[PDB]
Amino acid sequence: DPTIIIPKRANIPTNDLAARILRDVKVELVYNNSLHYVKIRASVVLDRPAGQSTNAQTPMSSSAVGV
Amino acid sequence: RFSHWVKFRMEESVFAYMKRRSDMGLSMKMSDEDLPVLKSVLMNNPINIGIRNGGILTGYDTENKVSY
């Protein structure tokens, strides 16, 4: 999300008050990229679509052993 | 022959179903929520095939008053 910060009167140096200048205002943005190149990986089967295991359990996301 | 034929088919049918459950990782459990399923397994392969072939009787009895 964009953010904006504005100085408060307690942080303006006395010199800038004489010159009447405000600075250190800060903004933040994120740019959105377009798409240029795309790659495809096609596959043509000949005899039978590849079979899959009958393991109907939910696929675990991590290994129990961690040492 | 019928009694033997009932023995064989009932035995293979239940086993053939347990393997499927145990081969998907979901083996059968004695939880009282899975046992009742045997009503459909047994009625499916052995019993119904018997009725369509005329081997097993069905209906009602007028003098004994019991159903078949």
UniProtKB/TrEMBL annotation, chain A:
<protein>
    <submittedName>
        <fullName>Structural protein</fullName>
    </submittedName>
</protein>
